Scaffold this active site. Structure first.
Site, short mmCIF file in Angstrom:
data_model
loop_
_atom_site.label_atom_id
_atom_site.label_comp_id
_atom_site.label_asym_id
_atom_site.label_seq_id
_atom_site.Cartn_x
_atom_site.Cartn_y
_atom_site.Cartn_z
N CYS A 135 6.99 0.52 -0.97
CA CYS A 135 6.44 1.56 -0.10
C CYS A 135 7.53 2.28 0.68
CB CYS A 135 5.43 0.95 0.88
SG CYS A 135 5.47 -0.85 0.97
N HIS A 146 0.80 -1.22 0.00
CA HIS A 146 0.00 0.00 0.00
C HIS A 146 0.84 1.28 0.00
CE1 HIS A 146 -3.69 -2.27 0.65
NE2 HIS A 146 -3.11 -2.91 1.66
#
Lengths: 214, 200, 212, 213
Positions: free
Chosen positions: A131, A89
């Site tokens: 990320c 994410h």
């Protein structure tokens, strides 16, 4: 000069899709909805290339050990290659981001020739949604974004990198040499306070990679 | 668009820059010195035949290095196809030697980031590193995270360059160099967005 | 098994044979005379750089033609990758000239059919003609398809040979041969209200590269 | 050098399958049964490549005129290319064999740039199963032959012919991936090893591919 990896095995191989979920707190509809797009999308594309797609996430701490141990130890002698997709994410608190680095180290570690004889001389392809530094002979590392680079952010339709990778995979997957195809993904994504996202890929392959049909 | 290539039809191919890391290295065996010359002289032959303006210097020239480094960064590359940089170095590598190299490469690569160098925007920047990014960058490493006639990597790279340099797509050629050396494991990281040929 | 290539890893690449059809042509402007040499000299440069042993002759030397022809036919090609033959000719073409050519090509192509030439069995035989004959592993390339307009010979050579050689020099080593011939199709068919469209008939069973 | 025909049209195009039946007297179960294999097989393969497959035979003398002209006159401006498959039998009495030569002349003739402006600059692909001569043409034509000159043809089985069986085999597997001539060469090797040696004559000026849509 035109030598290729020999892809004429009984099975293409395992396409492994790892979902990094734990230590991420607070997940908008987009992050939640966009991740499924990526996973579902990748599964379609990688199956059509003949892969046995296997998906799991690190939430299932008990399930992760067995599944990880199962894959590492299983015999890949009847297989052409190995693929691993690391999804993640955008928000990325520090524990989340840090966990990811460690998960990828270990994951990649399992398949180094020393640990995995079935794959010696065979392509190991890691596709990372960030990320980095790891490797062995016959490894191919593909990065959603190079160093310090800006990132696309996850939409409800998935991320730019995975959307484009899958787009190219569907269309040119069977035809093109893999790196040739990754370069296309480089251009595709880099064209999606304004700048650009520039993917990368590090190759330690020693021959050509085609995914012709079977 | 799948077979799209960088546009190599400019007046000049470009500058092939050969950087020699010499300072902070001590006790150099003749294999060290003559082997390094083999690499430099060899690379110059191969890269010239590909139409590059080969330029060589080393960091011993502390005064000369600034002007030369300075010269290259600022010069206009608008009439050029691409840019090449070869970083050569030795094996013994005391820590100051090894550490200096990391810094030299950072800076070198830094000069040509699109931000710093508009003439090269959209054009290939190729760095070939002998160990001890941005869009359109290609990084080639003598060795991954791992001779009086030169080194294996440079010997083979040049071998392939001479034979297949004009014919083959560059990454296609680098992969050959991966196999060649790993049988005597090099690496290459690509952020190129198209194909690279060095036709005549 | 789809990317299989002819195995070009022999000691010698092979013989590139350049046959010049001269006899029974009465005439011959400076351009025909001058343009033919351009083609021959040009082809020799290009084919040598691909590793061929270029051999040139013409049918004027009726005595020399017999010795040279059968000799090529009989020589052993076991150490060779392939065989190339270029048949060059002129534009005016009285009927005896044009007719002779048909017969010369029949015979030439005939020598290398697997039955006549065991050294070349399984190996590419490439005929470049400036029709229907054949065998397995033959590649026939024509300056012009059926009934079509032909370049006319200039003092710099003909369109087809000029372009073929142009592509050969640039892409000869890189590209699969038929891939390259297709490029020659497009190149020539765009030269300039008449259009010349080359052709090539392939009975090759694999890919053809001329890597160094 | 890597230029390709533009295959990004609304429709791929018409795959036409012509069946040469008339003037063939007496036909074994194999000829009858093997021809259907070829037609049915080709239709599957060519449809999966996005073609509008259309089949007819010359038995229907009245139906052939309407259908033939129809295809010739229809507008192909929204189409990538054109394909035509000429199927035929092995026994081939002389009138049968001779008729075929004439049918192919005419068929190919309809689509020469002069007759068919919608296809100018677009691939016209003729696949011929042989029993006047082989060679016809125009720019952007691709002619594929079951067998070269005078060479052996391997006879119709109840499962279809070697050439069509293999062509379809390759089409299914590599149709979308490979450049077409690259694929036809594969068919050359496949069949010549079942000698029968297929051929293809290319006047294409570019590459190609039949990627999906």
């Amino acid at each position: 000069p035109a030598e290729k990896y020999k892809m004429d095995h009984r099975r293409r191989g395992i396409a492994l899709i790892f979902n990094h979920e734990r230590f991420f707190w607070h997940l908008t509809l987009p992050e939640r909805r966009g991740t499924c797009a990526d996973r579902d999308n990748l599964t379609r594309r990688f199956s059509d290339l003949g892969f046995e797609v296997k998906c799991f996430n690190d939430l299932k701490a008990e399930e992760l050990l067995l599944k990880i141990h199962e894959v590492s130890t299983v015999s890949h002698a009847d297989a052409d290659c190995f693929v691993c997709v690391f999804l993640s994410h955008g928000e990325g608190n520090h524990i989340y981001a840090y966990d990811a680095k460690i998960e990828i180290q270990t994951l990649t570690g399992l398949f180094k020739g020393d640990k995995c004889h079935s794959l010696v001389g065979k392509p190991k392809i890691f596709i990372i949604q960030a990320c980095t530094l790891p490797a062995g002979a016959d490894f191919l590392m593909c990065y959603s974004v190079a160093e310090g680079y800006y990132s696309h952010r996850e939409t409800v339709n998935g991320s730019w990198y995975i959307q484009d990778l899958c787009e190219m995979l569907g269309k040119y997957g069977s035809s093109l040499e893999f790196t040739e195809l990754l370069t296309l993904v480089n251009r595709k994504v880099s064209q999606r306070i304004g700048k650009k996202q520039v993917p990368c890929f590090a190759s330690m392959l020693t021959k050509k990679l085609h995914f012709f049909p079977k």
